[PDB]
Amino acid sequence: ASNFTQFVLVDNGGTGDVTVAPSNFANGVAEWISSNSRSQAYKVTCSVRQSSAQNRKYTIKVEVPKVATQTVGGVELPVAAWRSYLNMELTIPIFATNSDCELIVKAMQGLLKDGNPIPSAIAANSGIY
Amino acid sequence: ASNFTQFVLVDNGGTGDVTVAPSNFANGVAEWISSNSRSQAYKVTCSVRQSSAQNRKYTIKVEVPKVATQTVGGVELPVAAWRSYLNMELTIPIFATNSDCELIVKAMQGLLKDGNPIPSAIAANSGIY
Amino acid sequence: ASNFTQFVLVDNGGTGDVTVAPSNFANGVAEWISSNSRSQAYKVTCSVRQSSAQNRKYTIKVEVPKVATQTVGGVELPVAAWRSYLNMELTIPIFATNSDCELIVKAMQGLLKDGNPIPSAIAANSGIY
Amino acid sequence: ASNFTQFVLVDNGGTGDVTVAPSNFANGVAEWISSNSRSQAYKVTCSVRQSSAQNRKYTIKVEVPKVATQTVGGVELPVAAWRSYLNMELTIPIFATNSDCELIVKAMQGLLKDGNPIPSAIAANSGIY
Amino acid sequence: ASNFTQFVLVDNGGTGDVTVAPSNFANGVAEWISSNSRSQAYKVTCSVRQSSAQNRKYTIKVEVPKVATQTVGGVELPVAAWRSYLNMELTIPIFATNSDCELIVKAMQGLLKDGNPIPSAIAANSGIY
Amino acid sequence: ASNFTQFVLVDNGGTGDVTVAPSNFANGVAEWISSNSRSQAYKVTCSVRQSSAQNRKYTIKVEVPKVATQTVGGVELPVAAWRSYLNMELTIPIFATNSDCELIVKAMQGLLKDGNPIPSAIAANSGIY
């Protein structure tokens, strides 16, 4: 069941979608990037290992470019002002079955579903109030 | 209106859905828990802070329990056999607009969407290859 | 093309086969793991290195679990009652051609072919008699 | 009945097979040797012992020669230019049944089956890629 | 689709072409080798890393052997009389777009094109004058 | 056989080609540049020497400007953000003949030929996957 394929990272209704495609598999770490320069591209990485005696840990990183007032192909500095970073670590005990892992995935999807407090706060440049 | 509202963490189609409701805002950490004992409850937390002069960081955590009944000293108690922990750290520059933040949210949603490589690998107890 | 793919480790006809899938490639050690619970999963690893100026060395390991349920204090977990461990080391001089390597592989396959003394002894809980 | 018999180590169709024959059983180590010159012969050994109170351990070794003629000072001798060495150790708990042992054997056979990653890598003078 | 595929390193017009095929990806270094013994094989390696915060560096290496047969202790072995080593280091800023990288590739191709000064000098065992 | 002449570094089908012409021969090091400012020009350098007792080494350097969003004739800073560097060293044993050197040149051309993994990865801002 090979799964290292391109996918739509940002869905805009079919027109203007952001697709990321495989770009590196060194050290077993899967990497996707969009069709941009490295400084302006969307980037996704994922790897999994045995973190402890009874846990496995998925390490997932996503980089998102700032698009407002962007100059496509230009040199934008400082780097920290134009990019957002997501560092996500999912720790799963070795006892969890496929059904348990499906439940965990559903939990993450519900956490980030549109209209829910966490995505609403992030999208509104706000905290919890 | 306040964004600190209850939401469906795990959507099973209307029956058996896991709902978490606001439970604490002490020390600046927003907390949600399911309607269970603290030993067996689902948990969601979220906080935001000025990580540096020009960046803001969201810290989001979710706990998924595997419930069980444990006999301790001849008495049965509701416990969790194990818990799966999700830890998310999201750093956003202060220069990001609302549209940029919406792009970040859509990126995360597309990352965790059903059928995509990372959720498929997590549900299948496997890495990316 | 790529040989870091999933393959059938145990061929139980057409139904009930044990398939292992790539999970990790850290430190140049390829690792395959079967699906469902990690505590009960099969494991295969392989790595190759230049052991001396004139020799290359393969290190191959396989773990076969006996699946069982553990119940301690009323809490049930999926575990391996015990595991069987295979450790293989194969040394091949740099002078060996592809034909020589194919001959070595055929030698190993004939070593483990059904009806031969060593697989018969292993399958019968017996030694050489 | 007896498993200390001659068997085909390398199956080159029907003509040119490499057969090894019993030669020695000293110190509980069974040894097979192919015919013609000992300096150029194939070698297979196998022994089993109680490694711990709960484990039995098989030690299996195979030597594959590269046949050549050595000429020193005008005197010609049949020698092995070099040898490939396989060392296998398999540990099986005393609790394993005959069915469990057959499963272990099938696991090894599937490990070395043609088209699988590890035999392909060995036969192609290659690692995992 | 994966870009880790075999390719013709030396094009002789269809007969006698030197082909290298993927052979290893351990430790993040992609390796290609020709269908020969390791002692006499052609070799290509390639790796990429974040050399600094704003630059990426490709490290590309090629080995061209001059094959021979050496008598060692009265036994003839396949060796390389000598090897020619090519070492390429290519540093690219993260701000470079795909078109910029295509310009880099075209520059290298034009640099090594038949009839040009540098390849003519290399083929003629001479410098530039 | 004088060979220090201008050549097409980047071929764009005859229109828009990038030509580099001789610009310096100090210290015996041949240098080519395009018709630009030194900060924005293509630059090629080449020299050869006896590197060791049994090896000669060609040292070849190429500088490529970032063209996307370029301001022709402008002051672009930092320098490291607008230029890519190739450092290529070819080591050839003193025993190699003209035919061997032609083979080495063919190897380099095949390495960098369009459609092959290394140029594809470089042009796609990607590694090996």
Please report the DSSP string for chain A in residue order.
------EEEE-STTSS-EEEEEEE-GGG-EEEE-SS-TTTS-EEEEEEEE-SSSEEEEEEEEEEE--TT--TTS--SSGGGTEEEEEEEEEEETT--HHHHHHHHHHHHHHT-TTSHHHHHHHTT----
Q: Which of residues 47-66 of C touch D (CB under 8 A)?
A: 47-48, 54, 58, 60, 62, 64, 66
| Torsion B51-B31-A47-A91 (CA) sign | positive
Q: Does C73 touch chain B (CB under 8 A)?
A: yes
Is the CB of residue A90 less than 8 Å from the CB of residue B84? Answer: yes
CB contact under 8 A, D108 and C112: yes
What percent helix, strand, coil does chain C show, rounded to 5?
Answer: 20, 50, 30
Nearest to B86 by CA among A11, A106, C78: A106
| Paired sense of beta strands B43-52 and B30-34, if any | antiparallel
Which 3 state secondary structure label does DSSP give B112? Answer: coil
- Angstrom CA distances, F18 to A6, F42, F81, stand at 35, 8, 21
Nearest to F95 by CA among E83, C52, B28: E83
Token pair for F69: 């969003």
Cα torsion for D97, D98, D104, D106, to the nearest 10°? -150
Alpha helices in chain C (DSSP H): 98-111, 117-123
Q: Provide CB contacts within 8 A for A78, sequence distance 6+.
A: none
Q: Does C98 touch chain E (CB under 8 A)?
A: yes
Place of tokens 């869905």: A11
For chain E, give me the number of helices (H) and strands (E)? 2, 6
Nearest to B119 by CA among C34, C24, A98: A98
φ, ψ (nearest 5 deg) of residue D6? -80, 145
- F79-84 contacts at long range (C-beta below 8 A, 24 or more positions apart): F79/F39, F80/E54, F80/E55, F80/E93, F81/A75, F81/A77, F81/E54, F81/E93, F81/E95, F82/A75, F82/E93, F82/E95, F82/F39, F82/F40, F83/E93, F83/F39, F84/E90, F84/E91, F84/E92, F84/E93, F84/E96, F84/E100, F84/E104
Q: Which residues of chain D neighbour C47 with C-beta distances below 8 Å?
A: 127-128
> Rounded distance, CA E21 to CA E83, Å?
19
> Rounded distance, CA C95 to CA C93, Å?
5
Nearest to A38 by CA among D129, F22, D115, E53: E53
Q: Provide CB contacts within 8 A for A44, sequence distance 6+.
A: A9, A20, A31, A32, A33, A60, A61, A62, B111, B118
Nearest to D86 by CA among C89, C103, C95: C89
Helix/strand/coil (H, E, C) string of D20-55?
Answer: EEEEECHHHCEEEEECCCHHHCCEEEEEEEEEECCE
Is the CB of residue B124 less than 8 Å from the CB of residue C20? Answer: no
Is the CB of residue D110 less than 8 Å from the CB of residue D118? Answer: no
Q: Which residues of chain F neighbour E98 with C-beta distances below 8 Å?
A: 123-125
Which 3 state secondary structure label does DSSP give C123? Answer: helix
Q: Which residues of chain C neighbour E67 with C-beta distances below 8 Å?
A: none
Is the CB of residue E43 less than 8 Å from the CB of residue E63? Answer: yes
> Rounded distance, CA C26 to CA C73, Å?
37
> Rounded distance, CA F97 to CA F89, Å?
19
Place of tokens 């790595």: C47
Token pair for B41: 């409850």
> Rounded distance, CA C30 to CA C26, Å?
7
CB contact under 8 A, B89 and A87: yes
Which 3 state secondary structure label does DSSP give E42? Answer: coil
- E73 DSSP 8-state letter: T
> Rounded distance, CA F109 to CA E9, Å?
8
- F90 DSSP 8-state letter: E
Nearest to A75 by CA among B102, F74, B107, F120: F74
Give the H/E segment covering residue E91: strand E75-93
Report the residue numbers after which chain C has a gap, meaning the C atom sits over 2.5 angstroms from the next written residue's N, or none.
none
Cβ neighbour number for residue E93 with a 10 Å cutoff: 23
Is the CB of residue F100 less than 8 Å from the CB of residue E25? Answer: no
Among C18, C64, C112, select the one facing D109 at the smallest CB separation.
C112
Is the CB of residue E48 less than 8 Å from the CB of residue F127? Answer: yes
> Rounded distance, CA B12 to CA B54, Å?
40
> Rounded distance, CA A85 to CA F110, Å?
39
Place of tokens 């899967």: A30
CB contact under 8 A, F126 and A24: yes
Q: Provide CB contacts within 8 A for B73, sequence distance 6+.
A: none
Q: Does C95 touch chain E (CB under 8 A)?
A: yes
Displacement of CA F60 from its chain's centroid (Å) = 6
> Rounded distance, CA A127 to CA B57, Å?
10
CB contact under 8 A, E118 and F11: no
Q: Does A77 touch chain B (CB under 8 A)?
A: no
Q: In sequence order, what are the beta bridge partners of F49? A: F57
Q: Provide CB contacts within 8 A for B38, sequence distance 6+.
A: none
- Rounded CA Rg of chain D: 18
Helix/strand/coil (H, E, C) string of C11-24?
Answer: CCCCCCCEEEEEEE
φ, ψ (nearest 5 deg) of residue E117? -55, -50
Q: Provide CB contacts within 8 A for F61, sequence distance 6+.
A: F43, F44, F45, F46, F85, F86, F87, F88
Q: In sequence order, what are the beta bridge partners of C127? A: none
Among C6, C24, C78, select the one facing A48 at the smallest CB separation.
C24
Phi-psi region for residue F28, left (φ > 0), alpha (ψ -120 to 50) or beta?
left
> Rounded distance, CA B39 to CA B33, Å?
11
> Rounded distance, CA A85 to CA B58, Å?
11
- E119 DSSP 8-state letter: H
> Rounded distance, CA F57 to CA B116, Å?
50
Is the CB of residue F94 less than 8 Å from the CB of residue E105? Answer: no
Strands laid side by side in the E18-24 sheet: E7-10, E18-24, E30-34, E43-52, E55-72, E75-93, F83-93, F55-65, F43-50, F30-33, F18-24, F7-10
Nearest to E82 by CA among E100, E67, E71: E67
Give the largest CA-CA distance in chain B.
Answer: 60
> Rounded distance, CA D4 to CA D21, Å?
9
Token pair for F106: 């063919």
> Rounded distance, CA D6 to CA F101, Å?
54
> Rounded distance, CA F35 to CA C71, Å?
80
- B121 DSSP 8-state letter: H
End-to-end CA distance of chain B: 45
> Rounded distance, CA E115 to CA E107, Å?
15
- Angstrom CA distances, B80 to A17, B36, B67, C69, F66, stand at 41, 11, 4, 17, 57
Q: In sequence order, what are the beta bridge partners of E84? A: E64
Give the H/E segment covering residue F108: helix F98-111
Nearest to B52 by CA among E97, A85, C70: A85
Length of chain C in terms of residues written: 129
Nearest to D62 by CA among D82, D81, D87, D83: D87
> Do E and C touch, counting CB pairs below 8 Å (3 needed)?
yes
Is the CB of residue A9 less than 8 Å from the CB of residue A33? Answer: no
Cβ neighbour number for residue B66 with a 10 Å cutoff: 19
> Rounded distance, CA C32 to CA C43, Å?
6
Nearest to B104 by CA among B56, B63, B62, B64: B56
Is the CB of residue A103 less than 8 Å from the CB of residue B94? Answer: no
- F120 DSSP 8-state letter: H
Alpha carbons within 13 A on the beta-carbon side of B78: 8
- C122 DSSP 8-state letter: H
Among F104, F113, F117, select the one facing E84 at the smallest CB separation.
F104
> Rounded distance, CA F95 to CA F55, Å?
9
> Rounded distance, CA F116 to CA E21, Å?
12
| Paired sense of beta strands D75-93 and D55-72, if any | antiparallel
> Rounded distance, CA D86 to CA D108, Å?
14
> Rounded distance, CA E12 to CA F102, Å?
11
> Rounded distance, CA B91 to CA A87, Å?
9
> Rounded distance, CA A105 to CA B123, Å?
7
Alpha carbons within 13 A on the beta-carbon side of B126: 23
> Rounded distance, CA A79 to CA C64, Å?
49
> Rounded distance, CA D118 to CA D116, Å?
6
Token pair for E44: 């290509």
CATH number 3.30.380.10 is the correct assignment for the domain at E1-129: yes
End-to-end CA distance of chain F: 44
> Rounded distance, CA D40 to CA D33, Å?
10
- E3 DSSP 8-state letter: S
Distance from CA of F126 to the nearest CA of E (A): 8
> Rounded distance, CA B36 to CA B43, Å?
10
Q: Provide CB contacts within 8 A for D76, sequence distance 6+.
A: D69, D70
- Angstrom CA distances, D114 to D120, D121, E37, stand at 7, 11, 21
Is the CB of residue B117 less than 8 Å from the CB of residue A1? Answer: no
Among C4, C47, C97, select the one facing E37 at the smallest CB separation.
C97
Q: Which of residues 109-128 of B touch C (CB under 8 A)?
A: 124-127
DSSP D80-125: EEEEEEEEEEEEEETT--HHHHHHHHHHHHHHT-TTSHHHHHHHTT
Is the CB of residue C112 less than 8 Å from the CB of residue D72? Answer: no
> Rounded distance, CA F8 to CA E113, Å?
9
Q: Which residues of chain A neighbour B107 with C-beta distances below 8 Å?
A: 9-10, 18, 42, 62, 64, 86
The type of residue at F19 is: T
Displacement of CA F54 from its chain's centroid (Å) = 25
Token pair for E52: 């600094």
Give the H/E segment covering residue D59: strand D55-72
Which 3 state secondary structure label does DSSP give D6? Answer: coil
